């Protein structure tokens, strides 16, 4: 998937 820009 297209990346999640949150802090994970």
């Amino acid at each position, epitope marked *: *998937p*297209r990346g*999640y*820009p*949150g*802090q*994970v």
Partner: antibody
Amino acid sequence: QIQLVQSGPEVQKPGETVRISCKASGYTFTTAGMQWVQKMPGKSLKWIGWINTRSGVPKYAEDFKGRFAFSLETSASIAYLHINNLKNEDTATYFCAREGPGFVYWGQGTLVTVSA
Amino acid sequence: QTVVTQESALTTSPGETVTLTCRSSTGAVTTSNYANWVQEKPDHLFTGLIVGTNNRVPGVPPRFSGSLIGDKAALTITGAQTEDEAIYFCALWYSNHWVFGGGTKLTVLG
């Protein structure tokens, strides 16, 4: 065990400010973002934004930008939600929830009632 | 507007496979939407169940799983139990915003 514990219920007048705390334990605070969510009475949930716990950089939903702000006390593993210039419509239960992606562990919620 | 919709309410007997769905008004749900499923019990006790479409939150019972079904996100409870009577909310990361569904009241007949 990962736990998020929020401060108690608040009753405030319109125009005032409320501050809600969210104390995290069971994991290293700076390794996951913290999100905030609003649930107005009898309605579904709205995302307020998140704050990066390593850099302190917040991201705010457009519908909350302005009167709603996030801060950290990192050394104590506490995240805060501040709401300024309170409006009657801010009356809701507010939740902190840890990343992620999204909303993995949830605080117990904090009821805020805004009334004159 | 991005509107996320869920079944209003579903009723099941214990032991059945029940599937809840989560649709976007603006397009297909894909793994790029990092679908989340959360459970609310009384009162406003929220538990995260699934994140990132299909990642079970550690400690959540094995009967919960997430997937995609057609154009929608899905939560499957394989063998519903009476403790699963709750309201289930999905959230989608859609156009770089978290948007929540309206919740599904699930009754698991006790």
